[PDB]
RNA sequence: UGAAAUACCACCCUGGCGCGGCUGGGGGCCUAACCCUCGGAUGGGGGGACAGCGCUUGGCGGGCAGUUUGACUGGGGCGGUCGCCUCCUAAAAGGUAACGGAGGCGCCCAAAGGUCCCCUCAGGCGGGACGGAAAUCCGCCGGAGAGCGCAAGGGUAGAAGGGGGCCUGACUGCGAGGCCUGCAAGCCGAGCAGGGGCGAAAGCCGGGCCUAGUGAACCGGUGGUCCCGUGUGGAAGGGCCAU
RNA sequence: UGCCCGGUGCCGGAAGGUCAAGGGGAGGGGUGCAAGCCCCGAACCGAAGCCCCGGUGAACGGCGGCCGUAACUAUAACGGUCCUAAGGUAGCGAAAUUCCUUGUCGGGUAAGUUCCGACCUGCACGAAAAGCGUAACGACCGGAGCGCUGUCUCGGCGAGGGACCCGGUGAAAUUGAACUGGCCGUGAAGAUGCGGCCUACCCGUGGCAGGACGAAAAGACCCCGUGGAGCUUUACUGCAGCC
RNA sequence: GCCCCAGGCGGUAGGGGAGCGUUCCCGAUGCCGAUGAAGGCCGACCCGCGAGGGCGGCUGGAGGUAAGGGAAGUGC
RNA sequence: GUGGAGCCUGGGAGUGAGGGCGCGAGCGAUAACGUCCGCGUCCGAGCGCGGGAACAACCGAGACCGCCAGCUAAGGCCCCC
RNA sequence: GCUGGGGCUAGGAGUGAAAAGCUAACCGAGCCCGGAGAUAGCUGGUUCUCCCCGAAAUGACUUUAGGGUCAGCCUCAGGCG
RNA sequence: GGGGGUUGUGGCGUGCCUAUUGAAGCAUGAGCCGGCGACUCACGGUCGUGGGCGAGCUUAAGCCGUUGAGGCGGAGGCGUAGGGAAACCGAGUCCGAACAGGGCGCAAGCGCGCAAAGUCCGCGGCCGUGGACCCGAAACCGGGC
RNA sequence: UGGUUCGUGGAGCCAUGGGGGAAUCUGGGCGGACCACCGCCUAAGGCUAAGUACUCCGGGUGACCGAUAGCGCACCAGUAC
RNA sequence: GGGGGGAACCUGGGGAACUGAAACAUCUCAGUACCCAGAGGAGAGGAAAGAGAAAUCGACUCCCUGAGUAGCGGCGAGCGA
């Protein structure tokens, strides 16, 4: 952890629900982070948008 | 007491609904029943014998579970297990809800 | 004067039929980004208290 | 007088903990180990940490192949 | 004609203006109230809704009160330590004390993860423009003494090491069984199902070579949930899931 | 009665920042068919207090360090440098303060860790917690001298009141029981009580106090107690009080 | 099968078992008691492993109280 | 291997100041009737008994009782004895 | 200045030429009653007999280290064998 | 009349209590005697047990009676089904997509009795709230003197 | 702010210190924030036996005490002191 | 008509702390101790602007139960309808 690592969720794109909480550090990836998931509620593989944790 | 420390029942998380003011909140309760108690019975049995027979208690709505040998009988509950209706319409047995 | 039930301990544990202690397992009320699925999933669960101290808890709960 | 020394982590309580000759369900833990003191061999899996265990049930087989390291096997019943 | 066409006529906005009202803030004045003082008091005088006295706002507040001010400890104090990892202590099972002997951790990696494919180091010698002790190159000798993110150790090239391809399993629901253990914690995990990744497949993939990188419960936040919703429907509010 | 207003306190300040209640209501929400009702609520206005600007020492308090340097040496009038808000001035100074320390020197003494006067290298003086001096004063504390002394060398006698004996009355503290010796050892480490020795006829009276870890007081010194109490404060919270 | 067989029997904290005794309730409108209760003193006597109990002698002069149970202000 | 052995299930505990001795170590000074550990023993709780003169843990040996019986242990057999 | 008489000021209060003194013989917070049988993880004590068994002084965690909860070790009852 | 009293000698022999690793201890307490003197009660819970009944068990307040006589009283409590946060379902329930897998459950005896779930009561152990084995503070607070 | 289980919680209800501040049944209050609906009751005046508490006191009764108990006190005790 | 007294027993105004939380401030102790006022043999309360889910009841008081339940709570201790 650090004020450079931060915390984050995983939006599905699809069901909007935040099905993960994974790290980053936002110096090396300054990018919203975004990973097909396993949606549990869409049920399926799904791309994930890095959402604000 | 754990000599000062964080007992075990501390340590441990809350869990559910613990209610709040005003409290509780009265809905009917059912005092679920099986077939293979009312076998002591004959032909129909109410609510009202079950809490003579000791066996409903009072202010609770009687449910038929599907426990025990059915027996081809006019009972009058509240609800019923659905196993309770196989055996008691398969038996024979009348399952007659009332309200 | 009848025993007063433990109500800390109402709200963290039921008894079962056999008269075991059953409450939920710890440590997933926070800091949870790096733990496993493992982790959250098997703490997801209730458990059975150790043997003495579900006795005593069953101590706390007279009227149960 | 002050000291820098004086702590020390938990014991962690590794080894062997069936030996051969001795029955075993699946999934029991057969090798409490760090890095590699037995390779996992015949019905032996091995966890993330180096951890020996049964994969099938039976009898385990300690087997030393020389240069080739000690192997673990868990012979059938 | 412009992206709109014209007078005139309305909804109106545009900012300003001033008329009034309802205002609020400051001034200045006044006098009954309210506050003194007048031996007279249904009257003088003076100040003046600026005081005093209520309620609440905030603040200063050892004047006062209730209290806290750790433990270990070769007495206490002073100093030091308090949690987890590594090694010895530790007596060839594990565990094993000392204010014993040594070091670490309070992270990091979107690749430093998965998978397929490819390669094998350090070091030494000789040759080689800059150029060296040590750049890059060549040959020769090398089992690992290298490297493996970071402490040590264990492990390791028949890779866990280096490079490339693709990919995100750094999965969901679980879990036979176990290890460890007072408990609680902690750890390993086949296998199964959903749905995927890589691969021809076999297979592997439930993060990282491992052992540290962390903290119970309570309180509360955020999102999902649609479970409860106090006569009913809503809602408030909670519960549960994730966090 | 020197310097420092840098921090604290206080005094003063209409600029400005912040800042509660209150006002305000952009907007948002629940509910209802609607009317409506209910609730959140941003902007902005909005007090002291605080920050901020100043002054303030007979307000709290604070008043440096290193290096070099002159006709032998020494030292440093002198210069350099760094820092501070400022660098301790007068005056005094081994002091009711000097640690080193019984410092040095001088006096006093045969001999003076004390006294007195200087020295200043003041560990750690110092100016209203006043500095320095000071006549008179002191059941104040020092040092010295003279006189006189039973203080003493070093003691002696005497007198009276007790102590001693007799007649009368007649306690008390304390007490495990006692038939209670020394030494050498042992023993919870210091023995009348244990062991080996030795010594000792029974009981008294007047005395001394070595012991009986004698008596007295559940050690006050020390530690501990999640004991109290008193006090302090820029410990926490609250309150009086005050704005 | 009340007796024999084998074995056991140091003991704090402590756990368990088994008894004794004190006051009081039932037994009890009973029974003992002036030919002497309780109580006191004494015994070298008897019972018991013991807690204790009898019995005896003297004092005492008026209450005591069984078997078998119960309840405690119960044993210094 | 039948033992006041073992296991499980329940009730009640006390204990959680230990100490000495031996051995293996640390610390200490290769000092301590020192401290701290491991293995073991004894005392604690066995200050019951014999020896070691005396002496908790050194040697012998586990005290149900009685006997004016016998055999041994360590230790002794010149007197105390 | 001292003293007599007459009075006033009292408990977190009075008074105090100030010692933290005095405030009815013990004042860093009077005395009496009451709360109250305060609390005391501390000290002491804890009373008849016989019998069986028989500890610990360790670990973990502890505002804990002389106290505690769990486990270790005791006993008891039942079951298993 | 074989015993009883005294002890001269010889042997052996470190008071008691507490507290302690360790006390004859020169650690604590006690001058001695007599009397008082400390683990209880209530109400809950739990374990065992003696009995009653038993898928039932069982009453409280009160009422009626005697005036030492009990009976009535079913209100109520426990038990008979668990799982789930809960709605809810039900020998299943929960998680879960799962009928997967797991968690918590359900299966009682013997020969109509024997029993027995449970339950009532007595007894006893222990625990909880009560002052909770007894004595002991320093202290705090209220009202007064 | 107090009472209510209600410790500010979603905080209703009763009460009321402040400041606002109604109407008379189509008026109002309440069913636990709040809105609509559905229902209950009629605030801001007063009184009211009974059934209940206690024992200064009289009486009856005790697996209550028996003069160190029982009340502090059996007696000339709230006394002597 | 009042005054004042009355053991306990009742409201009404005020209202502690010790203690528990193994510290302690919220809290608990407890609206208790105690003070004051008022009564009376009782007091209080008492005739729904109630209860609260049944279209149900029907002033009040007290006993048992509800129920240690709903709940409140540094969601602790505990308190608790
Ligand atoms: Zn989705």
């Given at each position: 952890?650090s ?10 794109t ?13 110096r ?6 975004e ?5 549990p509620?869409?049920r ?10 | ?15 559910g ?5 005003p409290?509780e ?22 609510p ?38 196989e ?12 309200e | 004067?009848k025993?007063?039930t ?10 079962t039929?056999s ?14 980004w ?16 150790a043997?003495?101290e579900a ?6 709960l007279?009227?149960? | ?8 982590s ?24 760090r890095?590699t ?7 032996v ?9 049964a994969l099938?049930?039976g009898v ?10 000690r ?7």
């Amino acid at each position: 952890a650090s004020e450079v690592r931060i915390k984050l969720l995983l939006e599905c794109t699809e069901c909007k629900r935040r099905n993960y909480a994974t790290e980053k550090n936002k110096r090396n990836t300054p990018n919203k982070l975004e990973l097909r998931k396993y949606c549990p509620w869409c049920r399926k593989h799904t791309v994930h948008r890095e959402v604000k944790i | 007491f754990e000599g000062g420390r964080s007992t075990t029942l501390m340590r441990l998380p809350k869990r559910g609904m613990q209610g709040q003011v005003p409290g509780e909140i009265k809905r009917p309760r059912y005092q679920g029943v099986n077939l293979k108690d009312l076998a002591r019975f004959e032909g129909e049995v109410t609510p009202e014998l079950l809490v003579r027979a000791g066996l409903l208690k009072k202010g609770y709505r009687l449910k038929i579970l599907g426990e025990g040998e059915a027996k081809p009988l006019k009972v009058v509950a509240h609800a019923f297990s659905k196993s309770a209706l196989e055996k008691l319409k398969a038996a024979g047995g009348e399952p007659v809800l009332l309200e | 004067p009848k025993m007063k039930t433990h109500k800390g301990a109402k709200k963290r544990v039921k008894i079962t039929a056999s008269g075991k202690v059953v409450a939920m397992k710890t440590g997933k009320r926070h800091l949870n980004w790096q733990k496993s699925g493992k982790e959250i999933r098997q703490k997801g669960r209730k458990f059975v208290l150790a043997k003495p101290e579900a006795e005593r808890i069953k101590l706390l709960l007279p009227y149960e | 007088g002050s000291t820098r020394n004086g702590r020390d982590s938990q014991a962690k309580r590794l080894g062997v903990k069936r030996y051969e000759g001795q029955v075993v369900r699946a999934g029991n833990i057969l090798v409490r180990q760090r890095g590699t003191r037995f390779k996992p061999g015949k019905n032996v899996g091995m966890g993330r940490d180096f951890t020996l265990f049964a994969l099938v049930d039976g009898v385990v087989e300690f087997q030393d192949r020389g240069r080739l390291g000690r192997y673990v096997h868990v012979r059938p019943l």
